[PDB]
Amino acid sequence: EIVMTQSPAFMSATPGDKVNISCKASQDIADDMNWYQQKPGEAAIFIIQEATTLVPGISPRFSGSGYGTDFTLTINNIESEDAAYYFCLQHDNFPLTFGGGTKVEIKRTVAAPSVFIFPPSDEQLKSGTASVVCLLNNFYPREAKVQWKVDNALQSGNSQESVTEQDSKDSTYSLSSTLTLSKADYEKHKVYACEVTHQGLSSPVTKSFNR
Amino acid sequence: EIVMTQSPAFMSATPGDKVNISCKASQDIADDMNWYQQKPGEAAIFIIQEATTLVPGISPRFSGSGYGTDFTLTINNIESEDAAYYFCLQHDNFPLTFGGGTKVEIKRTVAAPSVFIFPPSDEQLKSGTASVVCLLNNFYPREAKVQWKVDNALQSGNSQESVTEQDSKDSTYSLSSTLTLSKADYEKHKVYACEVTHQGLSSPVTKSFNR
Amino acid sequence: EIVMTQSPAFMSATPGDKVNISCKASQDIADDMNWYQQKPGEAAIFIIQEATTLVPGISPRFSGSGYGTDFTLTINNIESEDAAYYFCLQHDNFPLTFGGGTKVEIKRTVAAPSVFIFPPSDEQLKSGTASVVCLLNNFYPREAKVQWKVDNALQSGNSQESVTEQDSKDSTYSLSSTLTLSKADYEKHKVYACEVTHQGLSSPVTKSFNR
Amino acid sequence: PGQTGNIADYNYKLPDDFTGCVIAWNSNKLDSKVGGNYNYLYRLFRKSNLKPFERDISTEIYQAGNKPCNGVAGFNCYFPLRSYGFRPTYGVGHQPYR
Amino acid sequence: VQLVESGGGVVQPGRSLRLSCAASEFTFSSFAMHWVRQAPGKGLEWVALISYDGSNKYYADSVKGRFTISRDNSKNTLYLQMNSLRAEDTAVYYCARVSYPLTKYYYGMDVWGQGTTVTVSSASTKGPSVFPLAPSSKSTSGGTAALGCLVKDYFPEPVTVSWNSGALTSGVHTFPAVLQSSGLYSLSSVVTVPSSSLGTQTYICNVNHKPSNTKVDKKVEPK
Amino acid sequence: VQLVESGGGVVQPGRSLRLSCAASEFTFSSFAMHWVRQAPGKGLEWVALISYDGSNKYYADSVKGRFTISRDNSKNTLYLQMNSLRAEDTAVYYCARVSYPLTKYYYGMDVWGQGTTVTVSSASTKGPSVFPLAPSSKSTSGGTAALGCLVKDYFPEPVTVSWNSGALTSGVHTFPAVLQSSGLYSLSSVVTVPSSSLGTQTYICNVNHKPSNTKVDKKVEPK
Amino acid sequence: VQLVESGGGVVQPGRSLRLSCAASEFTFSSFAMHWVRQAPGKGLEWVALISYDGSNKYYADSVKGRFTISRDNSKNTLYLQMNSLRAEDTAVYYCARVSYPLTKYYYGMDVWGQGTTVTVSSASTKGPSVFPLAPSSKSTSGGTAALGCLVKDYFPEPVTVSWNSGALTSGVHTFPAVLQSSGLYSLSSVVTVPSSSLGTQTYICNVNHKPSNTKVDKKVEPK
């Protein structure tokens, strides 16, 4: 059992510069490894064979180096279509062990998100449930925090979050936050709010609802 | 692998006449075949052994002839209980192979079918499906064609056909044609019909329904 | 295959006295048997080994005897907690075969049952079904017979019976009888009754309902 | 020597250590007559195998059913002698030999 | 002389099954046995052969390596074991007896069986859905009218249809079940009734689906 | 010393299942183990035997060729694999331990387990439907009256019934579930209360169904 | 050159399943094959390997003794049989081909497949519950407003959401489904439209749940 460590797990790629990904082994394997690329929703693509040979049909931008325990994959002159999932595999001795993972995302300027508040419909109310949601749109950096406030008290339960994937057109993002409670508990309180903090905003924004 | 060809596949039997059934072999087998009869719903009956000998207990009307490659099963003085499934088997060399099969049916005069139609019930309508059927009864020759017309447009899909077997009482037939569609498509259109052409009818008959 | 027969299948035990249970074999097995006790809901208990040896940790009231084909289990100075399922196993030759079964119940005085009746609720009526039930409580002997009478006519169909187990506190019983019909059939008839006979009652008791 | 079939198991049988010759020649125009020469029979089945140079000679109606057929061969009661049907119009491989 | 076989049924692809053929009123140990099969809408096909002692076993090329044939002379039984069943194995299986006894060089057959059905599919057991065909003013013709009930969807083949608990069997026609696109069979059952007698009598459908334990009965509804 | 069985449940006919028996507080690797079963309304039946090393395995005739017995000494586990299950396999399965260690010629069991239930049926999971049994003038006797609710129709047999969140457990009787003609279980639960308390206290049915995640509660309805 | 996998789906714990890998446009009979899997939120894990003639088979330690790998060169198919599935087997399964032909000592893959999904759970299939997200007076911003519909329940994962029969595909975002505490999935679908277009056009949600055959459409409700 050879444990293979891949670094780093996440990165941001400014279009133009070079990027190095390190795959490291706990034992000596010589040139007995392969580098593969897999885009979401499709099959994996054979990229590098035996850590040095470039598979025909692939762009010459990709390169690989290393012998022994340390190996490096180098991508030069990154474009918008280089965002995928790269992994390194060893096929020296059983059992075959894969690396970790690496997701590459294109870097652009920071954008201020837009926040919307949606209250529950009457169908939930007659069903016995309440669901308040609030959503954020069009912000590049994922470092956005949304908290739930009722009567100036923070709630750390019954709150769920969802985030979409990287946008292919202009590299934006979206996020939704949902808070679900019972109608009996919904009637007890009057005011609700979601408080969002994001580095693209000068001050954090609170969106409130009262009815 | 000796290939056995049996002819004819389907035959009509006028009572009192004679029937010849031909079984042929690709290779040469000498008196190494048997003739079997099987009525629907029961087990097969051992009829003729080695193409010449008549098995005791069978009526002397049946006979067999042939040697080498061509074999003929002959039936004289056809009666109403001679309608069955006959097949020829060779037991010379492995693997054993059977014939194709012949279905014999009695012949009578032509009868004009009676055509009825039925629309969907409210159970289907409240479920979300529609099923329209129309049936033909009491016709001897199976050659009857039914087409489905909605808004004077033919339908070549979502149609199912069923036909009953030969009647032992008076040698008649029956048939049903059904269309199963969605509730939205059923409620969009208004007029439906099935149009039947049969040789016993001077003119084809159309059965319609509007609701 | 050695058939092993255990007798009796059922019995009634007084608070005192001794009880003998017979286990017989169709062949000679010497002392190659064990006696086990299993209370309802728990695991079986290893009571007697080799038909003569008392297992350490068990009360000395239990005893066993017998060599050859006939064997006897003896319980002396019965108590309330001696009601269980006793079975005899032989382990001489494959396949291993168990005995039959034996249930021991504590006997007490006879108690007159109490009978109650319950008519169907409106939920069944709006659903399209009717169910009438009548129950008996607090009677020692299980020989209670219930019959269903509608319009002075006895019904032996669509009726179900259920009976609980022996009570651990004061050794009583309970039983329920249910009659389920369609709402259309229920609407027609008006009078229903369940008639119960029990040896603890001087005369049979009929509970009726008219609506 | 060392053979299996109808003739080797239910008829004439040779030992494994044979010390002689076998001689066969076709006699089509000597034994095959019009209509079929029904004068040459061979045993069809038998409970076991013959001993070397040992020959069963007699026949009995084998009863393979539940009713005791009274010396009559019918259904589930078989006579263990089938005859050849040598006719002049047959092909080689089915013609008489000596 | 009778041969009875059973054990067939619906099974998922890739699994195993065992069929048993029972013989009676004849000496089972002195005869060789045949397993044959017939696919729907196709001619018969030989499957396997076993001798009267069990030493010789013959298989077909298509079923070689997956089917095993065996026998029990004490119990008078013949066993076929099927492993790694695929979609091509859906057929009706027949158990046949060799004409002559105590023979290892004859292969003719004279006694057959009624057959059993084996279905290789990955569907789920469903209950039928019965609905009535209400008589119409166009259904009457010469004083007689047509009526019936349509079963909608069910996977298991065996469905019994009867009218008035089997009392009414005049003019009744039960059409064969036909497969639908989704994979659930459907048939129709129509019986002719006089127009005058239609409005004064009671007609119900008695449909019993044994595999799913379904008991649903529908009364004809004149509209 | 303890033995725990797990892995039971409902399975469609012709499919496979695996049961595991766990041993503890003793050396599992030096004892032989027994698998036994008891069908409803029938005496116990021996099924299988495995030795302490695993070379010797014994099976009953009725379960030959379908059941496989195995063990894992490192994990202290005993496994039974069942394939091609049929209608007669519905029973309660018991895991037992041979009395003597390091022996291969004794075949005597002393320690049993609680057991698991395996059901071979092709029904559909359904939720209970509660209906209260309204008390009447006929239901009172000597100052006490009876009232209950009739849980009805559900395939998964285990259903827990409690009253007033378990507070009321005096005078309450829960009858065993009985199968109906349609093949779905239904039972009753009745508790007697003083007639004076009618209309003054609250009595509710706490019906909890695990497989279908059913949350239905019904209060007694005086009429 | 293409590899297609199929046969995956939801299954209860303890049951069995079979996955099939189909190859084409190359000589399937001269290559070795790999079965791989990837658990959610975890790295890839090797499962099994088979050679071109089927003689050599290698398994992972975790799936030892429970999975069986096989191949059919005549039908150009690869089979993986899974028995006694547990909660740890929920993953995405991949079928891979070794780079070099007629070699037994390389073990290097170059062609993959999209793969299938296997879920090990004991829940019940349910239908979605649509709920319109009524736009509010605070939703308008810069002449544009947001609207959507919340989708609930539907234990089976695949749910397709579209607007105006797929005509409206600009500004619409469908968030990934998120699991709830009770074990039932949930997601949202939101699309932004100009504020002026409100009250003049028609917007509907088109939810199509294949496993439960659910077809529910809801129009946005202005308030």
CSV table of C-alpha atoms in Angstrom, one decimal, chain C residues 34 36 38 41-46 49-50 85 87 89 91-92 94-100 114-119 121 123-124 127 129 131 133 135-138 160-165 167 172-176 178 180 207-211, chain F residues 34 36-38 42-46 49 58 60-61 94 99-100 106-114 130-141 144-148 150 152 171 173-181 188 190 192 218 223:
chain,number,residue,atom,x,y,z
C,34,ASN,CA,-30.6,-32.4,26.0
C,36,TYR,CA,-34.0,-26.8,26.9
C,38,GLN,CA,-37.3,-21.0,26.4
C,41,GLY,CA,-39.2,-13.2,24.0
C,42,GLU,CA,-35.9,-14.4,25.5
C,43,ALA,CA,-33.2,-16.8,24.4
C,44,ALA,CA,-33.3,-20.5,25.2
C,45,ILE,CA,-31.8,-21.8,28.5
C,46,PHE,CA,-29.6,-24.9,28.8
C,49,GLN,CA,-27.4,-32.3,29.6
C,50,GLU,CA,-27.2,-36.0,28.7
C,85,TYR,CA,-41.5,-23.6,26.2
C,87,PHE,CA,-38.1,-28.9,24.1
C,89,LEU,CA,-33.1,-32.3,21.4
C,91,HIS,CA,-27.5,-34.9,18.9
C,92,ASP,CA,-26.5,-38.5,18.1
C,94,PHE,CA,-27.0,-36.2,11.4
C,95,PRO,CA,-29.3,-34.6,10.8
C,96,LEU,CA,-30.0,-33.3,14.3
C,97,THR,CA,-33.7,-33.4,15.1
C,98,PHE,CA,-35.6,-31.5,17.9
C,99,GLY,CA,-38.7,-32.7,19.7
C,100,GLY,CA,-42.1,-31.2,19.3
C,114,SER,CA,-66.8,-9.2,30.6
C,115,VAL,CA,-68.1,-8.4,27.1
C,116,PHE,CA,-68.0,-5.0,25.3
C,117,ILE,CA,-69.2,-4.0,21.9
C,118,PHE,CA,-67.9,-1.2,19.5
C,119,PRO,CA,-69.6,-0.1,16.3
C,121,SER,CA,-66.6,4.9,13.1
C,123,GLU,CA,-64.0,7.2,8.9
C,124,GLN,CA,-64.8,3.7,7.7
C,127,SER,CA,-64.0,5.2,3.2
C,129,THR,CA,-66.1,-0.2,4.7
C,131,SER,CA,-66.2,-3.0,11.0
C,133,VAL,CA,-66.0,-5.5,17.0
C,135,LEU,CA,-64.3,-8.1,23.1
C,136,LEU,CA,-64.1,-10.3,26.1
C,137,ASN,CA,-61.9,-9.7,29.2
C,138,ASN,CA,-60.9,-11.4,32.4
C,160,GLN,CA,-61.6,-12.7,12.5
C,161,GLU,CA,-60.6,-13.6,16.1
C,162,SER,CA,-57.6,-12.6,18.2
C,163,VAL,CA,-56.5,-13.7,21.6
C,164,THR,CA,-53.8,-12.4,23.9
C,165,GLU,CA,-51.4,-14.5,26.0
C,167,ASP,CA,-51.3,-12.6,32.0
C,172,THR,CA,-56.3,-13.7,33.0
C,173,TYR,CA,-57.1,-13.5,29.3
C,174,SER,CA,-58.6,-11.2,26.6
C,175,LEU,CA,-60.1,-11.8,23.2
C,176,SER,CA,-61.4,-9.7,20.3
C,178,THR,CA,-64.0,-8.4,14.4
C,180,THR,CA,-65.6,-6.4,8.4
C,207,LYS,CA,-74.4,-8.2,22.8
C,208,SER,CA,-76.4,-6.5,20.1
C,209,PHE,CA,-76.4,-3.2,18.2
C,210,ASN,CA,-79.1,-1.7,16.0
C,211,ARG,CA,-78.8,1.4,13.8
F,34,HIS,CA,-25.0,-24.0,14.5
F,36,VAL,CA,-31.2,-23.3,13.3
F,37,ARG,CA,-34.6,-22.0,12.2
F,38,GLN,CA,-38.2,-22.2,13.4
F,42,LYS,CA,-44.0,-25.5,13.6
F,43,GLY,CA,-41.2,-27.1,15.6
F,44,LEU,CA,-37.6,-26.1,15.3
F,45,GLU,CA,-35.5,-27.4,12.4
F,46,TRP,CA,-31.7,-27.7,12.2
F,49,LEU,CA,-23.1,-26.6,11.1
F,58,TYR,CA,-22.7,-29.6,7.2
F,60,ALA,CA,-29.6,-30.0,5.8
F,61,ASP,CA,-31.0,-31.7,2.8
F,94,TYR,CA,-31.1,-18.8,15.6
F,99,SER,CA,-20.8,-26.8,24.2
F,100,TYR,CA,-17.2,-28.0,24.0
F,106,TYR,CA,-19.7,-33.6,19.8
F,107,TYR,CA,-22.4,-31.5,18.0
F,108,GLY,CA,-24.1,-30.2,21.2
F,109,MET,CA,-25.3,-26.7,21.7
F,110,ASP,CA,-25.7,-24.7,25.0
F,111,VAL,CA,-25.8,-21.0,24.2
F,112,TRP,CA,-28.5,-19.5,21.9
F,113,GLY,CA,-29.4,-16.1,20.5
F,114,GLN,CA,-32.4,-13.8,20.3
F,130,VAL,CA,-55.8,4.5,12.7
F,131,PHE,CA,-59.5,4.6,13.6
F,132,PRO,CA,-60.7,5.3,17.1
F,133,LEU,CA,-63.3,3.0,18.8
F,134,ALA,CA,-65.8,5.5,20.2
F,135,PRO,CA,-67.2,4.5,23.6
F,136,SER,CA,-70.9,4.0,23.9
F,137,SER,CA,-73.5,3.4,26.6
F,138,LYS,CA,-73.0,-0.3,26.1
F,139,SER,CA,-69.2,0.0,26.8
F,140,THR,CA,-69.6,1.0,30.4
F,141,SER,CA,-69.9,-1.5,33.3
F,144,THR,CA,-65.6,1.7,34.0
F,145,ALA,CA,-65.6,2.0,30.2
F,146,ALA,CA,-63.4,0.7,27.4
F,147,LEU,CA,-62.0,2.7,24.5
F,148,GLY,CA,-59.4,2.1,21.9
F,150,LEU,CA,-57.9,0.0,15.6
F,152,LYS,CA,-55.5,-1.3,10.2
F,171,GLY,CA,-55.6,-1.8,31.8
F,173,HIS,CA,-54.1,-4.7,26.0
F,174,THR,CA,-52.5,-5.0,22.6
F,175,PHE,CA,-53.6,-8.0,20.7
F,176,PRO,CA,-51.3,-9.8,18.2
F,177,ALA,CA,-51.5,-8.7,14.6
F,178,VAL,CA,-53.6,-11.0,12.4
F,179,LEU,CA,-53.3,-11.5,8.7
F,180,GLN,CA,-56.3,-10.6,6.5
F,181,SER,CA,-57.5,-12.0,3.2
F,188,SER,CA,-56.4,-3.6,17.9
F,190,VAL,CA,-58.1,-1.3,23.8
F,192,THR,CA,-60.4,0.5,29.9
F,218,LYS,CA,-55.5,10.0,17.2
F,223,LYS,CA,-70.0,10.4,21.1
